Assembly symmetry: C3
Homo-oligomer: 318 residues x 3
Amino acid sequence: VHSVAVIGAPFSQGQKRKGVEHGPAAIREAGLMKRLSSLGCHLKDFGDLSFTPVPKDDLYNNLIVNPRSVGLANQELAEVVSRAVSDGYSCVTLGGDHSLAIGTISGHARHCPDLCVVWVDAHADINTPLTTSSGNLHGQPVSFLLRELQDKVPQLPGFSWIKPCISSASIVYIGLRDVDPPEHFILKNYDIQYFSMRDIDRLGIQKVMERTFDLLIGKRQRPIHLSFDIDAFDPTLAPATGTPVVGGLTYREGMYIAEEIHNTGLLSALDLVEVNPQLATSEEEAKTTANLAVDVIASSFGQTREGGHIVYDQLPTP
Amino acid sequence: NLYFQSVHSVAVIGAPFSQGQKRKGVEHGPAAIREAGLMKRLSSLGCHLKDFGDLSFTPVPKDDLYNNLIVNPRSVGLANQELAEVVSRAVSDGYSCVTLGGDHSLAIGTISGHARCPDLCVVWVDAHADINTPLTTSSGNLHGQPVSFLLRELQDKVPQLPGFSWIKPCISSASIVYIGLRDVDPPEHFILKNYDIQYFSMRDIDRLGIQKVMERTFDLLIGKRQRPIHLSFDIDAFDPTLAPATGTPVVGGLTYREGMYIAEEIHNTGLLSALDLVEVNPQLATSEEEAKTTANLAVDVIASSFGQTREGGHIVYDQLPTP
Amino acid sequence: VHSVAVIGAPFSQGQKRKGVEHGPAAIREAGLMKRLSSLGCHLKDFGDLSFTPVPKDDLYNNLIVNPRSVGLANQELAEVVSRAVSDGYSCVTLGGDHSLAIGTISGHARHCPDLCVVWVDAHADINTPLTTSSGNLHGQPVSFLLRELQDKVPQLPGFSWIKPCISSASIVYIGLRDVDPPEHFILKNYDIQYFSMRDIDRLGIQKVMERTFDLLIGKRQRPIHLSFDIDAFDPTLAPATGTPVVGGLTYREGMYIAEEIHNTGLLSALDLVEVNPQLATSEEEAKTTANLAVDVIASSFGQTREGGHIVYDQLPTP
Ligand SMILES: N[C@H]1CN[C@@](CCCC[B-](O)(O)O)(C(=O)O)C1
Ligand SMILES: N[C@H]1CN[C@@](CCCC[B-](O)(O)O)(C(=O)O)C1
Ligand SMILES: [Mn+2]
Ligand SMILES: [Mn+2]
Ligand SMILES: [Mn+2]
Ligand SMILES: [Mn+2]
Ligand SMILES: [Mn+2]
Ligand SMILES: [Mn+2]
């Protein structure tokens, strides 16, 4: 039995590809609430938030895209996550692009001073506004949150409300395979631990999950924030996403990550982002992606491959 | 070719069961496997072949369902008493029986007939545990219940069904090992855990790897002494991308390589005595290549169980021709 | 900084399936040169070689199809490879069928007699003209190069120029899954080390690469010749090829092989063969295969999944 809050965040201004705002609708349509109900989760649906748009919000310093809208949407999102967490729920946020982790992690840290993050993605999303080549804020969220990067991050319009709330030793990446040269420098230079697809190929997902927990919760229990980008999966399994990168996690590795997070019993918040149903070549590819998003969330709250969720007490005798 | 690493005596049975479940099209299974080229493949491995052909099954006219759930119980139990005899015939003769399905209900017969060597051991490769009792089941389909009738520890929890009186509990808890489990119903999970039935689910394969799983499986079953092996193999243990034409497909299954590995290790013990290849449904395919892939896959599993390998070497080459 | 020469060898006479002659153009259209340039490579593209046609070329011993054509084109290819290798370039040859390895390995061995070969393929390509059942020369290249097999190889027309240049201890196979009975005999009888798909299932690709380098470069550094047949990959990843065989390398395993080759710093020549855009059922299937071929070549010259190939040592500050 878990108390689970669900928040829909139909937001796309962190990137340029249309349709990721329909990700919460597609995940809900795939039967998320019914699947969580069937696991025995006490649910509170906060619905799908309507973000206050910014009319005059264009290209900043000939590089940063929609900073005012991204900053504002995340400020609003942080308040809802804060409420859900302070009300004692494990907070599930449906994206929407990955810039939404600024809001979810900021809102979660308002109640958990010792929170740790497991970031599952093909990308590190740790470019600063000065290292980004694209200027898309979904490839930059971790830079605003990390304490060690405060002196490397300029003040963006709409971002003055953010306070760095996580240290370099409190975030572990899993699934990396498309990292920009400044991002690689940031990971190495600041000793941020990561398990790229190459590390998974060598160690295997079991050792990857063991080492992740040893680094984060080896010394003490801590609330875990699971920030799961659907593009961490191979594009054959998750085609409906904006930045697919070949050679991703298998369905089995993805479920394994989600199961191990459940087994800690320390899961406090989950982000499931970057499901863009409009980018799938067919309705079945949109549905496949959406169903995979439901399986990650369900496994993070007790769904297992061995079918031991619904406890049986007695077998009928003849 | 005149030289082979090993010569096996193998029998092929076409059992087109369909009354074990409700989805039609699984009867065209032994036909699709043969059309792929099974017989030609076993010949190329130097097998002494004995084809028993596609068996004829007649439905019982008055077949009322037991406890208003177990659909077609008389037709399934009657057909398995006879299928057991044909399988017991081949074993006594000194042959290795291979049954083409059809659904997984045919396993009650094959394992009972085989036991008529009593010190045998089973390897159940499936996405499903097929261990529901007639009272714990919810679908009414008998293909999800074969292991309940065969276990000695489950006799007190299984009632006497119409045409199931002939079945005697032959295999004990420590004589069955599952591989590939990913869709286990709550009563099935209670049975496995409480009766200490050793298994290797997809999660276990994810952690240990297919090599360790095979090493551990044999340490359990044939570690005490050399024993005959019954390989019951459901095509749905493989991922639906590889076996798309099947009844109950569950996402996140065995890769082609993992399934060939299981079959190769089974061959390498030299103790394989019986084999089942079920749930091939050519009617459940969206394209011709999807129907052909599942048939070609099923032939690969049986061929690997009798010598076919990735490196070759099954066929023995004497000397190279000189110019 | 790697000095890389690219040679297009639009070679099809080593087999009967037409379209493989379009393999070099397909690889170049998938962005090969742009990808190598971004790695910091100093490039020289020779373009596609125009091989001298042999109009009068009848089958040898009523089996061996187009021998003179295959032999002559390889003799010409070897002169080009020999020159590029002499001029300090790591020579990338784009195929074309795998019979072109006769010319690339022959040409490379002229200036690198201590070379070793890592042969990545579903096939051993080691039938002799006397064991072949197809009569396709792309299934026989290794028999012409292997020193220990000289007494078993008859003199074919247009093949006399070939001087066996590799010993059985200097070649390692990776990916084998479709081996003919005389090929299995050669592998065992001449003690040629191999890692079939079954060896990979057991050891894992990390141990496979460690064992490969222990056998080849355990005693001294040597120039490495990587002969990569795209059909080493599973047909779902590399569909546009002549002889697809199910249960091949995953994308991750293939990148791992290439990344490990790069890490030695010894790569001296690379063949990327059997990309046949005509055999793809759709335009996307041909592009998928060509994109895969580019990833193998880029990974062999530094492309990583971690992003550390480009020098980046100082963050911009606000
Ligand atoms: N080469 C890549 C790595 N860095 C990128 C990330 C965009 C995807 C971010 B997401 O999917 O995780 O949201 C960038 O634009 O900064 C391009
Ligand atoms: N049974 C197979 C093994 N030997 C074959 C190889 C042809 C493929 C060559 B290549 O793709 O590797 O280039 C042969 O024709 O000799 C068929
Ligand atoms: Mn992301
Ligand atoms: Mn991403
Ligand atoms: Mn079954
Ligand atoms: Mn099944
Ligand atoms: Mn080849
Ligand atoms: Mn090949």
